[model samples]
Target chain A: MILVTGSAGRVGRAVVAALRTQGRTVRGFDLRPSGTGGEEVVGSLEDGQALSDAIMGVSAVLHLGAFMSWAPADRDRMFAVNVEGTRRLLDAASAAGVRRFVFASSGEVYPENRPEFLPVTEDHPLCPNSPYGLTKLLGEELVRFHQRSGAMETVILRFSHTQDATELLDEDSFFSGPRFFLRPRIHQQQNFGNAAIAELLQSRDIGEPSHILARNENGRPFRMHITDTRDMVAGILLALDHPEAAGGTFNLGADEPADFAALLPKIAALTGLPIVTVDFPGDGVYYHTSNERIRNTLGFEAEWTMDRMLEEAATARRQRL
Target chain B: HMILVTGSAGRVGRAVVAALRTQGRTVRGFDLRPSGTGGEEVVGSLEDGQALSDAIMGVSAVLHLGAFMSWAPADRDRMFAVNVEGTRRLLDAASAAGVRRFVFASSGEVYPENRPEFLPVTEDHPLCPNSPYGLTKLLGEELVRFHQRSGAMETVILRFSHTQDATELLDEDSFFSGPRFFLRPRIHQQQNFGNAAIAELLQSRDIGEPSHILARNENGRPFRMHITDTRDMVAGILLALDHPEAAGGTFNLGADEPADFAALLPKIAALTGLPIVTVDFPGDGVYYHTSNERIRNTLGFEAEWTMDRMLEEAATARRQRLAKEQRR
Candidate 1:
């Protein structure tokens, strides 16, 4: 049986569902019950006895559990769950004689300020800007350590900005709330990207999708790549089964990157609100992550793009209306 | 206020403990064995939680240099236990004991090998260590960052590269002539200086006619790397402990400048009257030129020894040894 930690989370649930559909025996360990349950173990990553029990007779482990946070205030708890937690899980898995371990990482491991080139690869230098990013990178290192020791076949998937399309379309979604503006502060300086968007939001209460869209003085829009949770699940499944994925790291993202200039109009159309444009005096924030490695290695290609997300969101909104 | 130094029996730890004593500060030592300097000590492994707690009691600051350093795949578990879990235990105990400051001894190995984005690798360089030892250090750094962010303590990390005591340089089997100078057939190959060649060199040294062999890169340029003098490393650690700006900061501690093997080997040969052998081995070599600008600017500290000065001192030490042998 395969053990999946954090199986109650959004992507975790989808992964468990996919494995079940394939008729594979699955055991889920999470803080909350995985409602799609068959063999559930409810416990936190700090529980070593729980982890040992969770790994019993397990052939593989999908370690998707982590304490995700960007606030400096969460550093201690985050390290305990993300860094030490990973160590405990790895030790348990190794002891249990597990064959494979797939770790869910994030693109936040890449530097936000310096991109040596467009379309960052697996070999891109890792310098996380936020405490949350640091935790993920450290987890990746731990996985590498175990793999090199011949303990198990390990794979790391760096998911980029994963979100459920339906949730994004909700009226109270992050895109519709103050969090949309505040989230970028985790990886960017106050003068860059959505950090500037947040500063603009502070001075004026912009309504819904009609909020301010920022561009540099040179008229370049800030670019970001996002992954739909379903596509992220597809990559995770491939990582779990693909023979070539062992000892590899791959980036999973949408087919095409989108800039705010293109994204704002799509959001405006979906919400039926006009976006206000502004020329902010700051350098544009941009990164176009390439998924070519996953494509070439696992034969996996992303089917969802920002355009597909916005269009589906529009259709869902019409049905709701 | 008492300062505790882990790994007090080790090279860098002993230096730090001695330096702290010279400055008229109370010091405590912790290690697996008793410290040769003979002060208050708690001899125990990092895996010993009770020992860590006992050692940390009443300590105002910690200089953590204890680690299990190995790159062998078989030693990975022990390395993680000592370097990563051990650091966690130490940090937890220090926080509970109300230690105000922590200085972690990291390594330049934490930086990615042969893939440096820029020359003179700075503190901000991305870290993706390839070896088990390197990964453990990086993990330790993460824990240090956590305690600092939690406001439990002020943390400082110093990433040292190839440190050696000045006296060690005078030994014929030291780093300058050890396995590090030997070129391998492959990047990971374990082939050291050929057995015959090492014996020949040792015999020559015994006859007061020593010779040294150095490898050159494919481009015929000498490998460039940094080696910190232990005194300089201890000085930087002292500054990191006392300097307010050093709290919650990471700095690279290295020699004044990187050593070009081509330039340095010839200087050694001239000073010692030893013949030099330049070998062309098409294998991997470390080319990192670490930058110490941050430490210099932040703590107003500078490494006083240059490669030339270190070699000169070693040469003088070698002459004194030979004269003593003649007298005997």
Candidate 2:
């Protein structure tokens, strides 16, 4: 049986549902009380009993529980959950004889500013500027430690700026685009989906510590590079199944590259919103990640275009609201 | 202020502790091997939490240069146990004990071996470590960065190129001779001149060593070496400690210029008064030399021992030691 942590969250729900769709038995663990409930063991990640119960009889674990935030007030909690929580889970999983462990890292692990290079690779030097990024990186190290010791098979996926298409319709919304956040040139998008994570958990391939990334890219610069949530999930699933990716770090993204100047226009044209002044500010950080390694290894590619991703995201947002 | 220096019995560690004592700085030296290094020596491994906690008490800063290296395969498990995990434990203890400054002895080996994209790779270059040792160093760098980011301490990383006694070039059987320099993973008698550099930096304060190619270039080592002298490396360390702006940054320490083996062998043969065989290694592949612009421009410091000066000093030192041995 596979175990999914933080099942109450969006990605967790998606992963759990995807795994269930594949007819796999999955146990859910989360701090949130199961409202729409199933067999989720609701408790804090720090609770040994909760984690032990979840790890028992589990062959694989997809760790999605983390203190996700950029706010200063969330620093301590972030480190506690994202950092220490990972340690607890790894230890419990190790004791339980778990074979595969999939960790959800973030692009925030990279340095804040974009480099002169166009697409940042896994070998890039890390310059995590925030507590959130630092905690994720700490978690990545633990995964490496576990893998190096021959205790477990570990894979890390650093998901980029994953947001809803509804936010794109509102120019005034803080989450509208990278430009709204003051970082214009450096923009990344991932559709809301969980298939990739579920695939990462189910693959039985013997692999080294893998650090993969899930990012969005389109062929044209003005067109915007983004992946539908489902496409991102499928890409991850393919990676988990690929033998070549066992000991490698691969970038998962669209086959093409795009920009805000191109992406925002499509969103504006779709919603009939006015074009705001185009300003790509900040000389510090900017780069689109390359997915060539993943493409060659697992034949993974983003199937959805910018328009499709935005439209599907809007439909999902409307249905949920 | 009390300082804890790990690997205190090793070559670099002994040099550091000795220099620390001469400056009247209180030091608690910890090591796995008992080398009888003076000044509050604690013989233990980082595996002991209680021991580490005791050593950490009243410590102002930590100069962590301890690791199991050289003996490959046999020491892999012990190497990771001592280098990576041991470092994590130290960070925890140091944080708990409220130690403020952390000086990590990083290495030049962490840089990738593939043809470098730029000359004089800076701190900004991507890491592509080739060996288990290099990977461990990279892991150590991340740990130091994590501690600093968490607001636990001001971490300073110094990536030192190989440092050797000027006399190694003259030893006929030594690996520093000819193509053997390319094959040997490490030279046994070579000094980690960076320890002396770090010692001075810990003492003097402000420091930033540039990644420049010094005259000492090992033929096949992936990274460039501006082979540093013991005193010059020490001088860079002193500048780092004394300079107010040196905290929470990594600096590459090397000399101002890089020299080829061909150019260097002739100079060594002349200084030693010995006929030396010269063999050449392929230079078609790209290598890195550190650019000392940052250290020179920021700290107004440069290694005083140029190639000629180093040759002269090593010759004199070797002569004195030999003369003393003859009298005995």
Candidate 3:
């Protein structure tokens, strides 16, 4: 049995779906239980009782759940949830005798404001760049301490930027498609619904999968690792099951890297939509991943390739809208 | 520029004099007590504001090595006065004197036994050492680095692990030893990495590539070492003076890993063959495991001999005892 946290996230959502297809029992823990399209337990990471209850009888923990970052009101909340929450979870998991633990670490562990190296390996020195990176570093250290004592083996997977599997025909526009982008529970719930729609609006399948939120990052040159939620989740489960993967870190991403910069002309040609290249201080994110380690270890290849995921996502966008 | 070395009265101080003179440098000794072996004297305490001021002027750079550092409880006051109060005083004075660089001697004990997480540890490893001695060492490093980074002072921290572990040295003789005492220093210094063959022989025993060569340092006696050679002490000071990249860097100094006991016992049998057995005091439990990478890399320190070095060292001690017996 695999226990997945952050299960309602785009990657989490895809992972849950992938595990289901594999006919495996996966228990998901998400902030909004109903938001996940599958079976899940709704609770914040701070709920120790709920967390332990959710973790019961699970062979391994795919700890994909975390407050990746915070805006104005979330600084303390992120630490409480990510750092303190993980520390508590680690204690509970060790006490519970759940052996294998994997954390979703990040490339931000590197000191560079922008990544300094092409192929950053596990042995690369740690220089946490930001608060978000520092929390992730602390998580890895906790895992390492445990590993040194022979209690639980740890593996950290650094994820670059990833969104829901589907993006749109009007690709030049940063995030116009229908996708549950960012932390749906906090970012979207508070920013869009709570601020705008006080009453709960249940509009099922109403818009395109708005994968990348153009709210702040409109158009940029540097591409981020836009892994399919489906692929990322599936990869999480694969890591938990692979024995050789103990004490190793791997990058989770589709084999092919799609650039919003390069894909601009193709998007304009596809939708006949006016592709607006919103440019400012060059908000570009790069997509980089090394899938070989996890791929070779788990023998679980991603079913949705770059072409398949984006195209299927486009189709899903057209149908849902 | 002339060299200003603090703590020039202690073991390292005298050696620094010999080393600098060996290299033909203008050297001045500074310490609470003047050096007895003879050198240009500047008697002062690091904690004395007036002393710090007079001692620091007209100096291009300073080697801030003065401190009351020891594990003995009786010396705690001394340690604090020299280690903490002194370091604070000297660094502040250097800032005023506009000293170009300050080389401070530090230790690997900064990583406490229980606190060490990684093996074959790197400079980036976490530091939370155990004892007051270790803390003082860390404080010294922090003070040096703080000044360097703030542009108030520039510094280099030398973490030395000097042990007399040589693989191919010859045995010592007593009756003929007195007349040949001259040859012994030549042999001792050569095997000890004091001169000529030192570089070539050391290259054969590359310490870093096959690191922790003493992974099995279980010799019957605590490994002993000779005082720092004039060559090594001089080399480290010169490197820090010349290299900017060396600023704020921590380098470990030593020749090689733990000495092999099997080969050593036979030589001890020949040298202190009589009483090397009872040399340890009633409750002495000192283990000889110090870091040695600093001098090897930073100052290019290398010993001339190997296993045979230990054998000759024991023989030399046995001969020394006999000479004392004759003098009596």
Candidate 4:
């Protein structure tokens, strides 16, 4: 049996849906049930006993429980849930003898790209300035420590940004088209999100359709590994099942960088979209990532193209991304 | 009061207990086995958490010397248990018990191999230990400091130079001779003929004196530190125990250079009466004495006897022990 923590978050909900669709016996220990009762249990993993219950009889764990954001003040919650809570869960799993553990480590663990190494490897020295980065680093370190002791088989997936649960319309009408959060080159949308406010601000249309985005090509930033939430969740499930990932770390996203770089001019010329480029260095928070290792090893392929991703992006913004 | 010395049955712990007892302090010894002598309340093992806590109830200090001391090929499990887990658990109990101080018997082995590029190596040397023995020492020291940094207790580390390995007679024909191998897994020297080679290697003989066993007098064993210098180490401990300022820093404990030469031969001869020759210089990994900072500054102490002074007087004492043995 597989246990998913934070099963109610946008990505968490996607993971549960994808795993259940795969016919896996999955139990979710979440703070809130998915709308219309789409979860197994309504609980908080902060309590040690609750975490112990979630881990009991579970062969593998999909621990997606963390505060995912760039804000500095988010340290307390991020550290509490990601570092301490993950540590507690890992300890509980060790005590219970769970062998396979999959952690959703973030790409924020890397520093901005430099000329030395274009594609970052696991051996890079970590110089994480942001609290978001530090918490993820600590979490990875905890897993690495546990792995060193030969207790559990741990896999960390360094995830890049992508679309998730949201609903928005009239997104293509701001005299522009879909905007990926990675490049603040043009800030046509402000997504100040949290557990309490996302649903009110966004609708399901903002969640880019995963399958459609996987097979098309349109103008999108080649620097972004834009994989849809469905594809990301599928990658997680595939990575967990792959024997190659017994004790490893994989970049979970599209193997191909966006073709949007080529399509950006086409979008401007064809639609006359107003696009201005400015560097958001401080708030930019650039990260280096690669997913070929996972793609080749697990026979995992993301068929999403830029055009399809853009269409999904259009739908995602219409619903709220 | 009831302070715990982990390796109480070992040489350093035994001596420290003797010194502490002479000072009228309640020192409790904890070892892997119970002791009939020394009157110490011995705790059996590190795994016994309850026993460890019971021994540490009112203890103000802990002298953590209980650990695997060498790099025996077959000793990996024992090393991990005693050096790593032993250190971790003992530290946990110390923290839980609210102990005040932990004086670690760290060694000069923490320093790198060969004569250091600098004259006297400080604590800032790189800790990449080459041997399992050195690594365990480093780990135990760091673990203790980690516990101390948690604000549970204060730690004072003492880095003793290689003072005594094993001391015994070299051979029968050599008069006062006994063989000693301290590098053995066990330090029980009765297996060897009563020769203290490690200590005898340090004797500095005199050319002209009543019972002077000068250099090249007995045989060729190589000279080491004069015996008087090792005794003065007791003064370094006194400094640490007496001064509040010396609580956290690691201090070197050795007699100043130009140490007593044949003073060691007299002590050996004093213990056993026979003609004794002292080696002139050490060979291979030559061990030397350490600095005397805390002893001189804190206790207002000084080295009273020199190498020349002891070499002249040792033969008489050894002759008396021999005569007494003959009578019996």
Local accuracy of candidate 1 as per-residue lDDT tens digits, B82-182: 89878977987898788999999999878864557788799989776766678889888887876776665899999987888765555665544444432
Candidate 1 Cα outliers beyond 4 Å, as residue runs: A1-17, A20-62, A65-101, A106-137, A143-235, A238-321, B175-177, B180-210, B326-328
Query: In model 4, what is the error at residue B281, expressed in angstroms?
Result: 36
* True interface contacts retained by model 4: 0.00
- Candidate 4 interface RMSD value: 9.0
Residue-by-residue lDDT tens digits, candidate 2, A1-321: 888887887567667777778988888898895466666888888776788788989988888888676555555577668866786798788778987787877767774243335576777766786657767777776677677555577777766444444554433344444333222212222122334533432241124211111122332222223444555566556544555555445555565555555555555555443443322222322357666766777777677666777786556545655
User: In order, what is each prediction's RMSD in angstroms?
Assistant: 9.2, 14.5, 14.8, 15.0
Chain A TM-scores of each predicted structure, in the order given, are 0.88, 0.76, 0.75, 0.75
**2 or 3, which is superior by DockQ?**
2
Q: CAPRI band of model 3? A: incorrect
Q: Write the per-residue lDDT of candidate 4 for residues B228-260, one digit (tens) a residue.
A: 333455566556665687666666555455333
CA error at residue A180 for candidate 1, angstroms: 20
| Displacement of the residue B30 alpha carbon in candidate 1, Å | 1.3
Task: Report the C-alpha lDDT of model 1 over A121-173, residue by residue, as the tens digit.
Answer: 88897767566887888898889878866658999988877778775555555
lDDT score of residue A65 within candidate 3: 84
* Stretch of 10 with least lDDT, candidate 4 chain B: B179-188
lDDT accuracy of residue B108 in candidate 1:
86
Residue B99 accuracy (lDDT) in model 1: 92
Give the B-chain TM-score of model 3. Answer: 0.68
Best by lDDT: 1
Q: Using TM-score, give the best candidate's number.
A: 1
lDDT of 3 by residue, A1-321 (tens): 677788876566667778778898988987877464566788878897777887788777778788854463565566567765776677567767877988887777663235555444455666664657766765665565556555677778877556565554433323433222322322444554464322222221124322222211455454445566666666777677778878777766666555655654444444343433333233344534456666776675766655665577667657755
